[PDB]
Amino acid sequence: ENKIPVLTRLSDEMTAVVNFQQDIETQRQYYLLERRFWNADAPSMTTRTCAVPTPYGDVTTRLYSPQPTSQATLYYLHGGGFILGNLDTHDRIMRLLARYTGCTVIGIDYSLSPQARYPQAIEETVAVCSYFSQHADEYSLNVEKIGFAGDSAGAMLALASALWLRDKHIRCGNVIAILLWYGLYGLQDSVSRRLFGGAWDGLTREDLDMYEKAYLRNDEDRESPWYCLFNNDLTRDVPPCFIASAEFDPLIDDSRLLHQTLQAHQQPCEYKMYPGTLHAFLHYSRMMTIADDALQDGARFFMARMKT
Ligand SMILES: [Cl-]
Ligand SMILES: [Cl-]
To answer: Active site: which residues?
Structure first.
C-alpha cells in the first residue's frame, strides 16, 4: 500500500480522540452510539421541533434559539456520507453555532440515502427555506438574511442548496454566508484522495465510492451541476463561502479547488486549513479546542456578513 499512516503527524488533541475511539439501519444505530458521547454537555437553549411540508413529504426540522430575537437564520445540513446521521448526531455543533452567532440555527433532517437519492435532500432543503421565509413571523425568525452551514456531505448539501436557489431563481432571503467544513464538491480523484484516507477515518477510496453509489440515482448524475459543483457556474453570484479543511483528509483537495476556483473569479471566500486534523473533527469539541475554534471561526465569518 502506497498510503502511509498520518498518526505521527496528528496534533496531540487529535491523537487523544483517535485513542478514545477506536444492514443500513444497524450502521445508523452504531453511528448514533459513536456520536452520543460527543454531543453531551451542549449549550442549553430553547428548541422547537417542527414538521415542514416538501414535495416528497414532511421533513423534520429543529429550531435552536440562542437569544429571544434573531437577526439572521442559519440552516444547518449534517454530514454522514448521505447515509447516516440525524439532528441528534450534530446537536452540539448546532447549539454551539447558535451560541456563537447569536442567531437561530435550523437543522434539517433531510431524507437519507439510499432510500432517497440526489437531488431529493437539496429539494427538501429548498422547500424548508421557502417555508420559513413565508412563515417567519409565526416562528419568530429573521429571514431577511440567511446562511447555510454543513460538515462533510452536509457541506456538499449546503453549497449545492445555495446554488440551487440561485440557479432555479428561488427567493428565500439574502444568502449572506455559506459555512463549509471539510466538504466534498465533486472531484472524482485528486492528490489528497490518493495520499490519505484509511481505517482511522473510514474514507478509503472504496468508502467514498460506496457513499456516492448510495446517493446518486445513476452514474450520469456524477456530472450534474448540483453534485459535481465544479460543473456549475462558480464565476458569479456565489454567496460568500467560509471554506474550512482538515489537513490529513482525502477531501482537502475538494476544498482547495473550490477556494482557488472562487478566487479566480473574485468570488467572496475565506479558506482555512486546520493543522494536524482528520476529517470529521468538528464533532470533537469536548476534547479538542481546535474543533471549537473551527466552529467559532465559521460563526465569526457569518457575523461579519450580517454587517457587511
Ligand atoms: Cl435509506
Ligand atoms: Cl487553496
So the answer is: 152, 249, 279
Please state, in angstroms and as integers, the Cα–Cα distance from residue 161 to each residue in 65, 129, 149, 156, 185, following that order. Answer: 23, 10, 10, 8, 12
Resolution in A: 1.5
Domain that holds residue 35: 1-308
For 61, the grid coordinates are: 426540522
> Solved by what technique?
X-ray
Q: Is 224 helix (H, G, I), strand (E, B) or coil?
A: coil
Contacts of 263 (CB under 8 A, 6+ apart): 269
Question: What cell does 150 get?
Answer: 454543513
- How many separate domains does the chain show? 1
Residue 289 burial by Cβ neighbours in a 10 Å radius (0-12, 13-18, 19+): exposed
Ligand nearest to the CA of 120: 1
CATH of the domain at 264: 3.40.50.1820
CA of 48 to the centre of ligand 2 (A): 38
**What residues are annotated to the active site?**
152, 249, 279
**Residue-level length of the chain:** 308
Cell 496531540 locates to 12
Ligand 1 center to 115 CA (angstroms): 4
